Amino acid sequence: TKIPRGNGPYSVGCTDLMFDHTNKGTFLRLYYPSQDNDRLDTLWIPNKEYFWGLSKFLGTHWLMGNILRLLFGSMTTPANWNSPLRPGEKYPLVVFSHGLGAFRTLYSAIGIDLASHGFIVAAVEHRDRSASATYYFKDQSAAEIGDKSWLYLRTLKQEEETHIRNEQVRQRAKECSQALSLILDIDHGKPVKNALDLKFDMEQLKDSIDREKIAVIGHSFGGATVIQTLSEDQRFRCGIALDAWMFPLGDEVYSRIPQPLFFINSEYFQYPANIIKMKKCYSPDKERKMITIRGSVHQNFADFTFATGKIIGHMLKLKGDIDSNVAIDLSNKASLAFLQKHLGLHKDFDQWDCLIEGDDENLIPGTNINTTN
């Protein structure tokens, strides 16, 4: 278990929620403050088809899929699977959107760290075919016996891309809003029958959301999803884009983001055309912050940075010059500080306010890339 445990004082539980069972419903992984960190036994990549999906994304064979499955198939992540929700408190809510070729379970280092600080985190699984793999049920009977229909990553054409990637970012924002609706409906007593058959009873979530303290966070494609979801849905109060890939977004959205917005970048992923689209979101009247994590790579935000050793990590570009634990800790603590300021939380995350400013040895304020104005 090279995936780090949450740094905060709450115990972390984990479950999956699918509702409804169709290709049009919500599928999410939930991380939440539980009634104990008893065992930490949540399976990281819970189905063999995700490995096949992951092979596809890398552009490789049936063989590589089996090898991934052999290497990573029984790995756990430090959350207590299906542990009861901790009663007696209303929790702020994060909706988390994964990157291209990922899926709901691959951002547990972030989900678990937030949960440990008292948040409920819903990591959505997107059905736009940007996920390496996902599933749904063709009908109610198939759900009942666990008979899954799988949907795998869509590969494109160099020409198709503009329009396809835009439609995908639009579907993703809508899935994020839809997950939020599902949670808010459950919070208000809507009866919900999980299409999965799991010991966690969703009725625990009744009256357990602080309905006013909601945030969207996401990585790469999920970072663009943050921006689209915020422009559409003003129930989300702030967003945090982790190494956003801005390409999918339409020209019109940059003037359409009222909520506070934080860009946390890797050093090595970023390039001028991407940064200039980020700067396009800035306005004299709107809170925008930006920091870059020194010597970090794109994968430093995802759980695969924790999955191999330092040598194999560096060669595979899963790890950067920075220690992976140090990088995720800076991103998480900057994020918490930001969430405290903009969600109005009564916690001590403000002890990391200097991180939002990039005032640390492992941080750059803004970007090291340069542009005109």
Beta bridge partners of 292: 265, 364
Name the DSSP class of 296.
Answer: -
Tally of CB atoms within 10 A around 195: 23
Amino acid identity, residue 228?
Q
Tokens (6 digits) for 83: 């542990």
3-state secondary structure of 235: coil
β-partners of residue 219 are 242
- Give the span between the Cα atoms of 112 and 76, in whole angstroms: 13
Residue tagged 């490789």 (tokens): 60
Whether the ω angle into residue 139 lies within 30 degrees of 0, i.e. cis, is no
- Cβ neighbours of residue 115 closer than 8 Å, sequence gap 6 or more: 6, 8, 10, 12, 13, 31, 32, 33, 79, 121
| 204 neighbors 84 (Cβ within 8 angstroms) | yes
User: Would you kindly state where each structural domain of the chain is located, as residue ranges?
Assistant: 1-373
Q: How many CB atoms lie within 10 A of CB 32?
A: 30
The data reach a resolution, in angstroms, of: 2.1
47/74 Cα distance (integer angstroms): 10
What's the fold here for domain 1-373?
Rossmann fold (3.40.50)
Chain position carrying tokens 């736009």 = 128
> Quick one: CA torsion of 206, 210, 215, 217, rounded to 10 degrees?
-50
Buried b (16+ CB within 10 A) or exposed e, 291-324: bbbbbbbbbbbbbbbbbbeeeebeeeebbbebeb
Rounded Cα distance between 273 and 371, Å, is: 9
Long-range CB pairs of 136-143, under 8 A, 24+ apart, other chains included: 136/18, 136/21, 136/22, 136/23, 136/25, 136/27, 137/18, 137/21, 137/22, 137/195, 139/21, 140/21, 142/21, 143/18, 143/21, 143/195
For residue 43, what are the β-bridge partners? 76
Among 204, 193, 271, 261, which Cα is nearest to 19's?
A: 193
For residues 340 and 350, what is the distance between their CA atoms, to the nearest angstrom? 7
Evaluate whether 270 touches 339 at the Cβ level (below 8 Å): no
DSSP 96-108: EE--TT--TTTTH
Q: What are phi and psi of 8, to 5 degrees?
A: -90, 175
As beta bridge partners, residue 347 has: none
What is the rounded CA–CA span in Å between residue 33 and residue 136?
Answer: 27
Spatial distance between the Cα atoms of 190 and 209, rounded to a whole number of angstroms = 14
Which active-site residues does the annotation give? 220, 243, 298
Q: State the Cα–Cα distance between residues 288 and 241, nearest whole angstrom.
A: 11
Q: Are 207 and 200 in contact (CB under 8 A)?
A: no
Question: 7: Cβ–Cβ under 8 A, 6 or more apart, which residues?
Answer: 113, 116, 117, 329, 332
Q: How far apart are CA 250 and CA 228, in angstroms?
A: 9
Instruction: Give the determination technique.
Output: X-ray
CA 194 – CA 182 distance, rounded (Å)? 11
Cα-based distances in Å from 235 to 10, 35, 112: 26, 28, 23
β-pair type (26-33, 209-219) = unpaired
Nearest-5° Cα angle at 239, 54 to 95: 55
Looking at the chain, which runs of residues are DSSP E strands? Answer: 12-19, 26-33, 42-43, 76-77, 80-81, 91-97, 120-124, 133-136, 149-152, 209-219, 238-242, 261-266, 288-293, 363-365
The answer to whether 12 and 63 are in contact (CB under 8 A) is no
Q: Give the residue among 168, 158, 171, 190 at the shortest CA–CA distance from 20.
A: 190
Side-chain-facing half-sphere of 8: CA atoms under 13 Å: 24
Q: How far apart are the first and last CA of the chain?
A: 46
Residues 6 or more apart in contact with residue 158 via CB below 8 angstroms: none
